[PDB]
Amino acid sequence: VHHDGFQTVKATIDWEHPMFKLYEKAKRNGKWNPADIDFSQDQKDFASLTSEEKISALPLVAGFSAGEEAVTLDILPMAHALARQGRLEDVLFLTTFMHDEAKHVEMFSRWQQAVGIGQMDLSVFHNDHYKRIFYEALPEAMNRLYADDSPEAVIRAATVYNMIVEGTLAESGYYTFRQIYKKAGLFPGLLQGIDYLNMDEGRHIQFGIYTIQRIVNEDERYYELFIRYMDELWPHVIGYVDYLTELGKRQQQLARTYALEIDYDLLRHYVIKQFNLRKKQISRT
């Protein structure tokens, strides 16, 4: 429906708003372009590998590529809901959030193209637990906001997207990439991309913390809802992590070749740490 008026005609941007400040930082720190990354060495690395070694890296890339695409599509309802609420500074920031995720989709798709696996269907490495999070729960929670923008709905959406998908899974994925391939000296272009992604992710997670905390600040009983929604998704998080771990343990040729002692118990504890850490960044009071 209609606009009743416009904030930048009646007044100005709220220059001191936390999300205006986050928007300003995003513009300053968000200049990187996936089209500038040199993937030539990645191509050679991947070709050098045996078929067994080649397969090793793909489950993780499969999880990220679909994840970036899901979040690019599924952030749009949040931008709409906050826009309808007149939260202009949040919307300005969210334009940087969405543009970041677009570059993340682009970065992984360029890597796949470059190393010669674009024609390969990597959906085979999404198990039921992954599908429950990314094919179902994420888009359910975000799309709800089109018809229900209650504090309850907004907390559930920020929890699944910013605190679980980004703050638990994506963060653990970046850590895993560096623990495995940065050590091996493999895929320098991909690891350059991962570093830029991990920098962007910082702002995405901070938006989710801001959003969940400002709702909790109104009524501390929303804190219990946050914790509950975090716990509801945990079985699928660890169920996916456990599935990737088993794939990893079954095809170890890459680790042998490159002298990597991949401690899967250390990666598993990192996921658990991330999850608990995100819980602690929200204050009940």
Add this chain to the structure above:
Amino acid sequence: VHHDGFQTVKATIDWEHPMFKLYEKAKRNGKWNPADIDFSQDQKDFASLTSEEKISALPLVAGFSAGEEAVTLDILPMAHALARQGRLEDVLFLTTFMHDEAKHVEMFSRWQQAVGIGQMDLSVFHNDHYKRIFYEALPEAMNRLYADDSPEAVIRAATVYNMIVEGTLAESGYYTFRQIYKKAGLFPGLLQGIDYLNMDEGRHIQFGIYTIQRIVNEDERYYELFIRYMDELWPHVIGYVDYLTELGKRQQQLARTYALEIDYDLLRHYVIKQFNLRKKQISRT
């Protein structure tokens, strides 16, 4: 609802898609930051003016500030509709479109703040015709896409937003700013912003041409709909232009002071030219 799968897992980005190419150009040409513009001379210019001269520049700024804010909010339904249709490259491009409009909102709001009119309510310079376009028709046409993404609905939305608001009014506004203030040597910061806006606008209009043409290409009877929707809005376009012209003719102190022979008949013909020119960029066949 759920994702059935993901294009960048099954395959890759369509690298040859026109909107992927437009997205790539947006990243290359879209680096400018309103926070870097030096408005110090603008502040001094505005303070130097008499109250009568001060008032001269504000109707145009009022029209732009509200316009940028409306389009920042009202592009979100188009991104959603194309996302739901699986048009991934269009969505990637649209993240740059939305982020551009956010910077446009920011740029005018920084100028208002800097010259000392942020506290002034400029809604007084929106007449009924302006309100019909920006407070009503624009958001009606875009929001429709949430429940009706038929070719008819998508053509009406691209027509009002890209071909009328951007391709006719915004373009004519940029031309007007340069005809008046660039001549006077006034407001260098604002005119630097206008140049960056006008560069961005090129891509926005090209998205609308692409969108309307790909629908017309399917069925040439959609051409008649395009023309009809262009004509429906014309009375409000010229009605706003005529209102600004009369304000201009009533307070001429700025033009006298700075030796500007502001040909309002030339600006009016420029609007008419723009409108007819946009019609001609769509081919029936």
